Write a protein that binds this DNA or RNA. Structure first.
Ligand code: GTP
Ligand code: MG
Lengths: 77, 852, 74, 84, 73, 98, 235
RNA sequence: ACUCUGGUUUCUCUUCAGAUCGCAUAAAUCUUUCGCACUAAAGAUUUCCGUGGAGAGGAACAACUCUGAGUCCAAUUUUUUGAGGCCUUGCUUUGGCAAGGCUA
């Protein structure tokens, strides 16, 4: 049975197109290429980008350290 | 209510509120062998839940065993219910309806009266004695009454303070006990999902002398409250069973490090328990306070001055605390009774689960149609009024509410065994006090006042003006057979009514008691042994009738069998001279009477499955196997009525016209029997031919029932009739040196020793033997006197065996007051029973014919 | 001392998660931590726009999880 | 010294019908199956009142205890032994 | 922490994070300020009183406790 | 934590080298500090002391908060305050004008 | 430390003292670990036998408590019809003491004896050079032969933890002696007690309370039975 | 982790004690029962040997072990924040509240 940070390690082993949702910010999600996590689910993303739902203007961010206290959901593509 | 109840850890409003939520109720029977720790375990639970009720230092408070004969004999005699509120390991309080049942095997019937109203079983096993006679018998009777079985291996201190086993070898002892119980459950149940292991929580380890009680989870929680970061359930999954601890990798391995490491049970559980008991009993003065400081226990200076056994009980009361492993085990592994309502209704209700009332009884709802079921009658100590005890399976009894009590002979077409009785009072029955309640919802046990009059053994209390299609719960199928027969008369005949009154009362108190009057006006009590009938006779002379009562010598009830087919095909015409019946009687195949009695077959089956059984198992043709009419004196009795009437010679519809009366006469004939008016056994009655009258006022009823009994009797007598002896299976627990003494005691009483096997891990032996029950009177007295008390025997009914004589042998002279030799014992056993019965001096084979 | 949330009842079950910002999600549970972050196979997103969006294996932070409903019978 | 009294009352409420309100205003009434030290409540046979007033029937529910505003327990547990 | 063991069984008023009021008999608390209140009536604003019963209020949503009345008999 | 030692003064190595050192500066420099705090308020004062939760004792504070009318910025002066430190957004040493 | 004071009223003893006093009194004590030895030979058994005008063979004989039913004066009812009675073994005196309500018409002032107490399987330790917890050869051997979790599972025991009394030895040099003191007769199962008069201590009361040994002459046998008679009349 | 009780021994008195007051066991008297009463039983009373508890009084040395009381946590799950800002109505106690939509 999969434990979650093992699948985060498998995500960076896959260097997937990880789209991360936000806590309380349902409009803006962030695409990225995941590289590293830690004990507290802080995530660095190589080519991360903001996607709204009303605007949908994907803004490119570069390699970010999105805090663990802000993420909701790590989907792929 | 508001009665004056003792001080308790909970409060009775919380008990009455846990009564409503029937998910938090555990109806539990504590059953085991004699003196295997059940009453002392209930004492430990009572001392846990009652701070003012404390065991004396040198003498164990029993707190059940509330009868005078129980306190004097030391043997539990009646099941005492105890309703406590016990907290779990997680701290959750569950209502516990606990039936402390007698472990003596003669009082096995009392366990059945607890097994009916229970959803689960805690089988108590002496850790020294291991699995004994009544532990095997209550494994069998617990998995056959469809109950969840858990095990409390009580008296583990005997592994420490008596045998002084090493902790590895006492682990081997406990593992052998758990393996023996697993083998017995796999023997008496095809299912293997009820494997008992302490890893599952099914097995609890205990010492009710010293108030030790732990499962693996509750011992792991002592580590979890001592050391914080450990999760105790995962630890409890590793504590038992060939799992070793690696303290360099800190991990539990199946492979043993160092080849001298111990198992996790020995290292983490048994060696701390040994060190606690060894530091108390050996090193109290020198080194008990530093190990007590290591365990977190501080005792007062007044408390360390105690003697070594009360100090052990106190030290383990402070270490182990409450008995939360028992509650772990009975909550995880004994049903809800919401969950346990459906196997209870499927097994014990006569309508089954598929009825409209069986559905509403499987739901177990307190706002349902009232379907209480009482199995025990508890006399108040004035002796006059009884209180029916049982569980509410649906609805709610109320005090003051009129109610419809259905006796055991109530069928839906015979509605006369019912009676509308006003419920007087309701009690939640703890053992030495009763909590008077206004109502009792479903799933709970209740003492009911006022419903005691219309019932003898077993009641189904329903409500009047509804539940018109309400059937009874099944009567208590007992573990054994009440065989020992004593005649009972008053010393002064003028106080016969008191005795008759008292006889009715012992018929209420003892569930497998049979009080009858024979045709000589002789009052007869049937019991399971001499301790059972000694307590019945004590209650008869002291509790119920305050009069003096002569007892006869104990005798046994015999059965009657045949050994060959009947010589001439016997016949009987009715007093009309129409309706000739023509039967032969032949002996049954070997093991078939055991199959009919142990419900391996039923006439409640269809003809296809019944015929398929008798074809594939006993080499019957399907001609004969589809022609079975009935099953002996009851619906499960050891005789068969077959019709081999061809449809060419007999009209089959005209034969099915009188099938009911021929079946009734056959059942009555096998119930009495022509040798000595005691049950016919292991006889196949083949109706060869049957003339039937054409018009129904000439056949049927008063003509064909006594005619069918006469042809059953004559077909039986023309076959070569034999008497059958009840044989007691005797399990003797002797020392190793007293084994040849047990053989010597048994050799004087026609007993054949089956086995003498060492109790593995104890210095004792078990001699399993087969004594005749007519030769077992004072056998345990002979054995314990001859061995100076070192050997001890429990004898329970096993089978019926043919007496070595021939009962129809007028060649045999019997001087009246002599022990007869074996080859004409049956001739002694037949006529004296016939004299006791008062029948004629001899039965001729031609008494029930029509030619003379 | 962080005990794992008691979810082997819900392993391999079809559950509908509610997430923080009025959000919703559906999928098969595959495991957890003591922090109740859930890993999900066959994840269908199910937004409030009304059209159902399959993903597959996702991971959900346990902070954002309001409720589990086991849609499958446990 | 380690575990508090209200979590003991929450463990005492298992099997009973509790009604738990969560952070998003949704009220869940039904049979509390299991509850942990954190207030993670596995409940069952749940009547749900949402914020609008709609009532749904959700037969197996696991609420994360962080989001629980309060639980209304049965008053039977006013006589529970840890509340003495 | 005797500053609220001083307040056990007093009829207390608990203002919450949404602004709702819990007037209940303060039975128990712990280190996380989870309250057990029995016979608790909720007061919200338009005035109405909503009886609840035994409320296990989680400590996250508790702002302020204050006494309404003395402990009953 | 892999540093379970009793003699823990790493928390003011935190306050000399790390991120919170900005306020030990105003413990020692006695500099005016602008605090953007959670109710869209500004607290300018001078922090006397603080530690790891960023709870600060501030002296002689002007606090700014603006109201809608469409926003006019109001002020109130407070003597001296304890500020719970999760109730901040940002903390600012007020800059070198000269 | 060891007694009350100068009044000599209460003593409290160390278990090595009680062990060596138990060993010094070994000749006066029978080393029974039970009262199963006194089955049909205890006080209740003798009160029963006195009440039934029956004599247990090793036991006392009294005057009849009640006037006996003369079994040549009863007049052949249908109850005592000897042609109905199946005789297998003679119903002994012991059976009417053991089950006084089953085997006696008119059991009056009769005492239900204690039944079995479970057989105390205490292995006396012959060798003190043996461990106190030792698989003695009196113990019958246990012939050897489980939902175990996998070793791949990540359950670790934490550093502070080990078994509860790992530093404590399993047995000490006075552990088997204290276990023997558990099964020692009174007063040796005590470690505290109240002081008794030298009159009040019968050194040989539990000698005639045993069965009289084999091979004894008749005068010592009647002496055992009459010591039992006045023991039972006292009690 | 700081402070105030209570002690223990011995001698005596007083009262209660159906509790094995005694893990021991005497004697007297009366009544009953049978013998025909040391060699005999029952019931009851009494006296002795000599207890436990409580209370009280003396006098010997111990006085704070014991029984009590008064006296190291910012990273999901609670207490070191998803917080704050916009729009419509019902009433405005013209401060604004309640519900919903939002935006972050
Ligand atoms: N050594 C030891 N003896 C025990 C233990 N538990 C009970 N006993 C003793 O064993 C005897 C068993 O008596 P009970 O437990 O009361 O009787 P029971 O087990 O309920 O069986 P029944 O007599 O049929 O009711 C008692 O005399 C207890 O003193 C124990 O854990 N260890
Ligand atoms: Mg019992």
């Amino acid at each position: 049975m999969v434990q979650p940070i093992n699948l985060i390690f498998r995500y960076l082993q896959n260097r997937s197109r990880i789209q991360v949702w936000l806590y309380e910010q349902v409009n803006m999600r962030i695409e990225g290429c995941i590289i590293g996590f830690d004990e507290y689910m802080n995530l660095v993303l190589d080519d991360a980008e903001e996607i709204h739902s009303k605007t949908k203007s994907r803004k490119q961010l570069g390699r970010i350290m999105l805090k663990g206290d802000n993420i909701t959901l790590l989907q792929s593509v | 209510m508001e009665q004056t109840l003792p001080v308790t850890v909970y409060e009775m409003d919380f008990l009455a509120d846990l009564m409503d939520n029937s998910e938090l109720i555990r109806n539990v029977t504590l059953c085991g062998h004699l003196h295997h720790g059940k009453t002392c375990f209930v004492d430990c639970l009572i001392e846990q839940t009652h701070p003012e009720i404390r065991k004396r230092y040198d003498q164990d408070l029993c707190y059940t065993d509330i009868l005078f004969t129980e306190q004097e004999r030391g043997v539990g005699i009646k099941s005492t219910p105890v309703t406590v509120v016990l907290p779990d390991t997680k701290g959750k309080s569950y209502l516990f309806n606990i039936m402390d049942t007698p472990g003596h095997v003669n009082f096995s019937d009392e366990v059945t009266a607890g097994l009916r109203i229970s959803d689960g079983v805690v089988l108590f096993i002496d850790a020294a004695e291991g699995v004994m006679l009544n532990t095997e018998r209550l494994i069998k009777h617990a998995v056959q009454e469809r109950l969840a079985v858990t095990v409390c291996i009580n008296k583990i201190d005997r592994l420490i303070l008596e045998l002084k086993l090493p902790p590895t070898d006492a682990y081997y002892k406990l593992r052998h006990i758990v393996d023996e119980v697993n083998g017995l459950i796999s023997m008496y149940s095809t299912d293997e999902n009820l494997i008992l292991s302490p890893l599952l929580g099914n097995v609890c380890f205990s010492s009710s002398q010293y108030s030790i009680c732990f499962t693996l989870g509750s011992f792991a929680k002592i580590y979890a409250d001592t050391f914080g970061d450990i999760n105790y359930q995962e630890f409890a999954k590793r504590l038992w069973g060939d799992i070793y601890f690696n303290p360099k990798t800190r991990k539990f391995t199946k492979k043993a490090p160092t080849s001298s490491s111990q198992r996790s049970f020995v290292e983490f559980i048994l060696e701390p328990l040994y060190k606690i008991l060894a530091q108390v009993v050996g090193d109290v003065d020198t080194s008990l306070p530093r190990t007590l400081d290591e365990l977190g226990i501080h005792l007062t200076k007044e408390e360390l001055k105690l003697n070594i056994r009360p100090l052990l009980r106190l030290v383990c009361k402070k270490f182990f605390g409450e008995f939360t492993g028992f509650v772990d085990m009975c909550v995880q592994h004994i049903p809800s009774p919401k969950v346990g309502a459906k196997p209870k209704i499927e097994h014990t209700y006569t309508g089954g689960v598929d009825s409209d009332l069986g559905e509403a009884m499987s739901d177990c709802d307190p706002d349902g149609p009232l379907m209480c079921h009482t199995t025990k009658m508890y006399s108040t100590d004035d002796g006059v009024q009884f209180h029916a005890f049982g569980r509410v399976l649906s609805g709610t009894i109320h005090a003051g509410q009129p109610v419809k009590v259905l006796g055991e002979n109530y069928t839906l077409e015979d509605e006369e065994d019912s009676q509308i009785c006003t419920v007087g009072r309701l009690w939640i029955s703890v053992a030495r006090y009763h909590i008077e309640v206004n109502r009792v919802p479903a799933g709970n046990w209740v003492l009911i006042e006022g419903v005691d009059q219309p019932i003898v053994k077993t009641a189904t209390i329903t409500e009047p003006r509804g539940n018109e299609e309400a059937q009874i719960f099944r009567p208590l199928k007992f573990n054994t057979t009440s065989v020992i027969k004593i005649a009972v008369e008053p010393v002064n005949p003028s106080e016969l009514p008191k005795m008759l009154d008292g006889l009715r009362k012992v018929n209420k108190s003892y569930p497998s008691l049979t009080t009858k009057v024979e045709e000589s006006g002789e009052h007869v009590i049937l019991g399971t042994g001499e301790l059972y009938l000694d307590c019945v006779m004590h209650d008869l002379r002291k509790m119920y009738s305050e009069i003096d009562i002569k007892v006869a010598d104990p005798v046994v009830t015999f059965c009657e069998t045949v050994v060959e087919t009947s010589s001439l095909k016997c016949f009987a015409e009715t007093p009309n001279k129409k309706n000739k019946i023509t039967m032969i009687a032949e002996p049954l195949e070997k093991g078939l009477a055991e199959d009919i009695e142990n419900e391996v077959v039923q006439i409640t089956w269809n003809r296809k499955k019944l015929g398929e059984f008798f074809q594939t198992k006993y080499d019957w043709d399907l001609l004969a196997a589809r022609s079975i009419w009935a099953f002996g004196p009851d619906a499960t009795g050891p005789n068969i009525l077959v019709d081999d009437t061809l449809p060419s010679e007999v009209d089959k519809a005209l034969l099915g016209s009188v099938k009911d009366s021929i079946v009734q006469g056959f059942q009555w004939g096998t119930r009495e029997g022509p040798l000595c008016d005691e049950l016919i056994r292991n006889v196949k009655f083949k109706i060869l031919d049957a003339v039937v009258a054409q018009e129904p006022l000439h056949r049927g009823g008063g003509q064909i029932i006594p005619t069918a009994r006469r042809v059953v009797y004559s077909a039986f007598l023309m076959a070569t009739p034999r008497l059958m002896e009840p044989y007691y299976f005797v399990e003797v627990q002797a020392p190793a040196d007293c084994v040849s003494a047990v053989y010597t005691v048994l050799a004087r009483r026609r007993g054949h020793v089956t086995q003498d096997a060492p109790i593995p891990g104890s210095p004792l032996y078990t001699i399993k033997a087969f004594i005749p029950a007519i030769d077992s009177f004072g056998f345990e007295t002979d054995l314990r006197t001859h061995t100076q008390g070192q050997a001890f025997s429990l004898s329970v009914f096993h089978h019926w065996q043919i007496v070595p004589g021939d009962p129809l042998d007028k060649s045999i002279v019997i001087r009246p007051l002599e022990p007869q030799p074996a080859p004409h014992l049956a001739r002694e056993f037949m006529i004296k029973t016939r004299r006791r019965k008062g029948l004629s001096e001899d039965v001729s084979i031609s008494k029930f014919f029509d030619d003379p | 001392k962080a005990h794992p949330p008691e979810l082997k009842k819900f392993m391999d079950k079809k559950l509908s998660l509610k997430l923080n910002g009025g959000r919703h999600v559906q999928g098969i549970l595959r495991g957890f931590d003591p922090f109740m972050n859930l890993v999900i196979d066959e994840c269908v997103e199910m937004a409030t726009s009304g059209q159902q969006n399959n993903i597959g294996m996702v991971v959900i932070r346990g902070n954002s999880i309001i409720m589990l409903e086991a849609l499958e019978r446990v | 010294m380690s575990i508090g009294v209200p979590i003991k009352v929450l463990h005492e409420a298992e099997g009973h019908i509790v009604t738990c309100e969560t952070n998003t205003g949704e009220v869940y009434r039904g049979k509390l199956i299991e509850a942990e030290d954190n207030m993670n409540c596995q409940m069952s046979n749940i009547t749900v009142t949402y914020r609008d007033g709609r009532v749904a029937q959700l037969e197996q529910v696991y609420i994360r205890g962080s989001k629980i505003r309060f639980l209304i327990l049965p008053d039977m547990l006013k006589n529970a032994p840890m509340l003495k | 922490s005797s500053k609220m063991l001083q307040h056990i069984d007093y009829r207390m008023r608990c203002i919450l994070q949404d602004g709702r009021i819990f007037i209940g008999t303060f039975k128990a608390f712990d280190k996380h300020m989870n309250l057990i209140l029995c016979d608790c009536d909720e007061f919200r604003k338009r005035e109405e009183k909503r009886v609840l019963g035994l409320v296990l209020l989680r400590g996250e949503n508790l702002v302020s406790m204050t006494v309404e009345g003395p402990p009953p008999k | 934590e892999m540093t379970p030692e009793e003699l823990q003064k790493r928390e003011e190595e935190e306050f000399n080298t790390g991120p919170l050192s900005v306020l030990t500066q105003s413990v020692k420099n006695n500099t005016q500090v602008l605090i953007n705090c959670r109710n869209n308020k500004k607290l300018l004062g001078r922090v006397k002391a603080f530690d790891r939760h960023c709870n600060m004792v501030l002296e002689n504070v002007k606090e700014m908060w603006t109201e809608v009318s469409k926003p006019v910025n109001k002020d109130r002066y407070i003597s001296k305050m304890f500020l719970r430190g999760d109730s901040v957004i940002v903390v600012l040493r007020n800059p070198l004008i000269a | 430390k060891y007694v009350n004071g100068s009044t000599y009223q209460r003593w409290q003893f160390t278990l090595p003292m009680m062990s060596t006093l138990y060993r010094l009194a070994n000749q006066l004590l029978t080393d029974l670990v039970d009262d199963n030895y006194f089955y049909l030979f205890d006080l209740k058994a003798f009160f029963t036998s006195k009440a039934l005008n029956m004599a247990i063979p090793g036991g006392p004989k009294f005057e009849p408590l009640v006037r006996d039913i003369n079994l040549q004066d009863e007049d052949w009812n249908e109850f005592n019809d000897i042609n109905k009675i199946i005789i297998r073994q003679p119903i002994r005196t012991e059976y009417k003491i053991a089950f006084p309500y089953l085997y006696n018409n008119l059991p009056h002032h009769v005492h239900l004896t204690w039944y079995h107490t479970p057989n105390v399987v205490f292995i006396k330790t012959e060798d003190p050079d043996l461990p106190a917890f030792y698989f003695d050869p009196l113990i019958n051997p246990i012939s050897h032969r489980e939902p175990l979790p996998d070793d791949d599972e990540e359950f670790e025991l934490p550093e502070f933890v080990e078994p509860f009394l790992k530093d404590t030895p399993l047995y000490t040099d006075n552990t088997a002696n204290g276990i023997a003191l558990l099964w020692a007769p009174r007063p040796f199962n005590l470690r505290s007690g109240r002081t008794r008069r030298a009159l009040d201590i019968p050194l040989v009361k539990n000698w005639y309370r045993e069965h009289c040994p084999a091979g004894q002459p008749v005068k010592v046998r009647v002496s055992y039975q009459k010591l039992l008679k006045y023991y039972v009349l006292n009690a």
